[PDB]
C-alpha cells in the first residue's frame, strides 16, 4: 500500500527515484491505495516532525510511515517512540535518530530499528578483542540509555569466558567532568583496551583530555560502539587513526539500500495479513481530538532476500549486516571486515601495528618476530577449539600454512603455542616491556653461504629491517659475520650420541671407515649447521654424511628408537631433550658437547640494532639472578 518514506536526513537526495521502487520490490496488484510519498525534513526540531506527521495523517489516513535520518539523536528516538506508542503505526528505523537503541522500550510501541542491539555489539567487540588476545580492558559508561544493560552483559560474558579477562574498575561519566575529579580516575587506567561507551561529543572530550594530559600512547587501543560512529559523513579530528568503530551501517549500506528492503518487508506483511484486516490503512483523522488483526506485531518474521531481519520483543534486527571498519590516516573509515550471522567474518585478520595513531606520535616501539617449526624448540600446535580461544601462557602465533601446493590461499589462523621460545618471548615482553608481532610462516631450513642461497628463518634474519627472532640456533661463521647474535644463554655444543666403546669424534674409526665402522647412515638434517661445520673441519666426513643423508628429526628419532640408526650428531641440548623421553633409555650420549664444537644458542638480532643492548641486558639478568637452576629443572626433565 502507501509507503511514506519520510527521509529526514540532512543530505538533499533526489526523492523522485523512490516512487518507481514499487516495481522491483514485489509489484503486486493486491494493494490498491499505493500512495508512495517522500519528504525532506530540513529544520532539525521536533516541531517540524510533529507538523509533518500531522499533515501525513490527514492524507487519507497514511499508514506505515517509515522514518530515517543521518545522525543519531536521542530526541528523535524518543519522538518516534512516542509516535509509535500513540498512533500505533509500524515505523521502521533505518538510520540516524530512528536507529538510536534505548534501554527499555514500550511494549505497545512498534519501533522497529535496523542494526545490532547492545548485546550484539558487546558480543562482536568481545570476539574482536579475543581474536587479538586483548584481555586488559577498561569499561567507561555514561548517562545515556544503555549502560546498566551493557555492564550486565559485559559481566555475564566475563563469567562464562574462563580464559582470563582483566576486569578493571568501571569509570562512570553520568555527571559533567571539571578536570578535577575525573583526571585521577583516568590516570589510574593502565589497560590497553579502552571501552568508551559514550556519545560523539563525550568521546571527543575524552580524546581531547587524553591528548592534553598525556594518556594517548602507542598501546592504547580505543574502541567505540555504533552509538559513537552513527554517521558516515562527519568525522572529528580528535579521534586518532586506528579507532575501531563497530557501526551497524556504512556508506555501502546507505538509506536507499534499506528503503527497498523495508518496502519489501512491508508489502510482504500486507499481502500475508491482508485476509484478516481488509482496510489496513486505518489511522487517525488529524491531530485535533484524535491491535486485534492489524499489521503492528505481524511483520517480525518476514525474511527479505534471505536476510534474518526478524525483530525481538522491542524490535531490532537479530542478524544485521553490520560492517566493522577502522579510522584511516586521511580522516576516512577504512573497511577491515564485517560480521555474518553465523560467526565473525574478519576480513583483515592481521591487525596493523599503527605505530603512529595521531600526528604527534614519534614513538615507534612495534617489533616483529619470526619463528619456524623445530623439534627441540617450541612444538607447533593448534588453538583450543572448545572456546575458539586460548590462554595467556600460549602466545597466539600467526600461522601461514596453505591448504594445497598448487593453491595460493594462505590460512592465517590464530593458533597459540607453548614452549621454550614462547616463554622466552613472554619474559622478554614482561621485563623489557616491548610490543612484538609474532608469526609462524612455513619456510625452509637453516640457510648458509652455499651458492648464496638463504632460506628459512635464517635467510629472513640475515637481511636487515628484521627486529629479532626467538629461534636461538647454534653459533656459526656466516650467521655471526652477517648479524650480531646476543650472549649465548646455553653452553651446549655439537656432540655425537651413538644409539659405548667409542670415544666421541676422536675415535680412529671415523678416519678409516674401511676396516672398522663401515659406512652407514651418518648424515644430519639437510642444510644444517653441523654440515657446514664438518665441511669446514672434515671434508671426507661431510661427503660421507652427504651420500648418507637421512630424513628429518622425527624420522631420526624413530630410527633411534628402532635401532637402525647408528649415531646421531647434533647439539648437546637437542640430544638431552631427546634422551629425556627415551623409551627405555637405550641410546646414551657418549661424551658431552664441550670438546668438539662448544657452541651456544644466540638470539638472531639485527646488525647494528638499538635493541641488541636491551636483549643482552635482559639475558644477563635472566641468567644472572639465581633462576638458572629453576629453568634447568623446569625445561630439562631427564629422568634416565
Amino acid at each position, epitope marked *: 500500500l502507501n509507503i511514506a518514506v519520510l527521509l529526514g536526513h540532512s543530505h538533499d537526495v533526489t526523492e523522485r527515484e523512490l516512487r518507481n521502487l514499487w516495481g522491483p520490490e514485489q509489484a503486486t496488484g493486491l494493494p490498491l491505495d499505493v500512495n508512495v510519498v517522500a519528504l525532506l525534513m530540513n529544520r532539525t526540531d521536533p516541531k517540524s516532525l510533529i507538523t509533518h506527521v500531522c499533515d501525513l495523517m490527514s492524507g487519507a489516513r497514511i499508514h506505515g510511515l517509515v522514518f530515517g535520518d543521518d545522525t543519531d539523536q536521542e530526541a528523535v528516538a524518543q519522538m518516534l517512540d512516542f509516535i509509535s506508542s500513540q498512533t500505533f503505526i509500524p515505523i521502521l528505523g533505518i538510520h540516524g535518530g530512528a536507529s538510536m537503541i534505548m534501554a527499555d522500550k514500550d511494549p505497545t510501541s512498534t519501533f522497529f530499528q535496523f542494526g545490532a542491539s547492545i548485546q550484539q555489539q558487546a558480543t562482536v567487540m568481545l570476539k574482536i578483542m579475543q581474536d587479538y588476545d586483548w584481555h586488559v580492558f577498561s569499561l567507561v559508561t555514561t548517562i545515556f540509555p544503555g549502560y546498566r544493560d551493557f555492564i550486565s552483559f559485559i559481566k555475564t560474558t566475563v563469567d562464562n569466558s574462563f580464559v582470563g579477562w582483566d576486569m578493571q574498575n568501571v569509570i562512570t561519566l553520568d555527571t559533567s567532568f571539571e578536570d578535577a575529579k575525573t583526571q585521577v580516575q583516568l590516570k589510574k587506567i593502565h589497560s590497553s583496551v579502552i571501552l568508551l561507551y559514550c556519545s560523539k561529543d563525550e568521546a571527543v572530550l575524552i580524546l581531547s583530555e587524553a591528548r592534553s594530559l598525556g594518556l594517548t600512547g602507542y598501546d592504547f587501543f580505543w574502541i567505540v560502539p555504533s552509538l559513537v560512529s552513527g554517521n558516515t559523513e562527519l568525522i572529528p579530528k580528535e579521534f586518532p587513526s586506528g579507532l575501531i568503530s563497530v557501526s551497524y551501517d556504512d556508506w555501502d549500506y546507505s538509506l536507499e539500500a534499506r528503503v527497498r528492503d523495508g518496502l519489501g518487508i512491508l508489502t510482504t506483511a500486507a499481502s500475508s495479513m491482508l485476509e484478516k484486516f481488509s482496510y489496513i490503512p486505518e489511522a487517525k483523522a488529524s491531530c485535533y481530538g484524535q491491535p486485534l488483526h492489524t499489521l503492528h506485531q505481524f511483520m517480525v518474521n518476514v525474511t527479505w532476500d534471505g536476510k534474518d531481519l526478524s525483530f525481538t520483543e522491542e524490535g531490532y534486527q537479530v542478524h544485521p549486516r553490520l560492517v566493522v571498519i577502522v579510522l584511516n*590516516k*586521511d580522516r576516512e573509515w577504512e573497511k577491515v571486515g564485517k560480521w555474518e550471522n553465523q560467526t565473525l567474518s574478519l*576480513r*583483515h585478520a*592481521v591487525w*596493523p*601495528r599503527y605505530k603512529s595513531f595521531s600526528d604527534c606520535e614519534p614513538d615507534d616501539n612495534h617489533l*616483529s618476530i619470526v619463528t619456524l617449526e623445530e623439534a627441540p624448540f617450541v612444538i607447533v600446535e593448534d588453538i583450543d577449539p572448545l572456546t575458539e580461544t586460548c590462554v595467556r601462557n600460549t602466545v597466539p602465533c*600467526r600461522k*601461514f600454512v*596453505k591448504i594445497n601446493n598448487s593453491t*595460493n*590461499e*594462505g590460512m*592465517n589462523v590464530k593458533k597459540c603455542c607453548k614452549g621454550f621460545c614462547i616463554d622466552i618471548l613472554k619474559k622478554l615482553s614482561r621485563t623489557v616491556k616491548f610490543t612484538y*608481532d609474532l*608469526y609462524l*610462516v*612455513t619456510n625452509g631450513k637453516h640457510g648458509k*653461504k652455499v*651458492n*648464496n642461497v*638463504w*632460506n628459512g628463518m635464517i*635467510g629472513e634474519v640475515v*637481511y*636487515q*629491517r628484521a627486529v629479532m627472532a626467538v629461534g636461538s640456533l647454534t653459533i656459526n661463521e656466516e650467521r655471526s659475520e*652477517v648479524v650480531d647474535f646476543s650472549v649465548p644463554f646455553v653452553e651446549t655444543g655439537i656432540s655425537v650420541m651413538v644409539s659405548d666403546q667409542v670415544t666421541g669424534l676422536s675415535d680412529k674409526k671415523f678416519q678409516r671407515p674401511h676396516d672398522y665402522s663401515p659406512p652407514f647412515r651418518f648424515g644430519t638434517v639437510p642444510n644444517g649447521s653441523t654440515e657446514r661445520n664438518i665441511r669446514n673441519n672434515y671434508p671426507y666426513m661431510h661427503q660421507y654424511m652427504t651420500r648418507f643423508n637421512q630424513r628429518g628429526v622425527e624420522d631420526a628419532l624413530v630410527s633411534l628408537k628402532t635401532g637402525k640408526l647408528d649415531a646421531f650428531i647434533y647439539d648437546a641440548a637437542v640430544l638431552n631433550y631427546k634422551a629425556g623421553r627415551d623409551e627405555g633409555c637405550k641410546l646414551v650420549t657418549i661424551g658431552s658437547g664441550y670438546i668438539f664444537a662448544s657452541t651456544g644458542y644466540g638470539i638472531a638480532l639485527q646488525k647494528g640494532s638499538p635493541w641488541k643492548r636491551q636483549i643482552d641486558l635482559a639475558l644477563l639478568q635472566f641468567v644472572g639472578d639465581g633462576e638458572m637452576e629453576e629453568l634447568e629443572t623446569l625445561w630439562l626433565t631427564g629422568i634416565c
Partner: antibody
Amino acid sequence: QVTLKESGPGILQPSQTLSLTCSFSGFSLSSSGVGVGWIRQPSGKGLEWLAHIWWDDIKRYNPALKSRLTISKDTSSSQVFLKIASVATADTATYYCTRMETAWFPYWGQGTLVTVSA
Amino acid sequence: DIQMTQSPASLSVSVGETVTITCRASENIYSNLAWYQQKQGKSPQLLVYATTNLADGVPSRFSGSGSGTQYSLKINSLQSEDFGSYYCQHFWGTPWTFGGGTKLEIKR
C-alpha cells in the same frame, strides 16, 4: 602465466591523492613468497624504492617519505592500490610493481604513465 | 643508507672488448648484489642476482664476481643485444637504493 598490468590517472593535479592500481593474474600476494612492490623512476634520474609489502601483510614505509606513503593490497580482487597524498611535480615518475623475491628471475610489468601537473 | 656509486654513464666499449662495470659500495659492506639492465623504454631485466647465479633468459657471458665493497660485472662477449642502462640494486639493507646507470656505446 605471470602477467602484470599498471593502471592509474595519467594527468592529475599536484597536492592530491593518486589512484594507482597494479592489476595482475596467475599468482597472489599472500602465497608464501611472491608479493608486490612499488618502484618509480623519474625522468632523467635513476629508480627509487619507496615501500613494499610481504606475504604476511606487513607494511614498512620509507623514512624520508613517512608522511603520506601508505601501501595497501587486497587478496579478494588481487589488486594493489597505492595511496600517495601531497604529491608535486617531483613525484612525476613511471611507477612499476615487479617481483621482490629470491626466486630465479623477478618478473616486471609494462607500467603506466603518471604525469602530475596542474 | 648504503651509498651506491656506480660507474659513470660515459663508458663506451666497442664490440669484442670486455666490460667492467665498476659499481663501488659504501661503509656498509654487503654480500648480495642483483644486477639489472634497463633498455630504451623497456623494464629493467635482472641479469645476475646475488652476483653468483644466472637468471632465465640471460646469456652466459654476463658473469658477476667481487666481494667486500668492489663488485664488477664481467661481460665476456659484448653483442648488440646488450644495449641499455645497467644498475646495481642491492637487497641487503633496508634502503634499496639504485645505481647511477651504465650506458654502453660504441666508440667509433
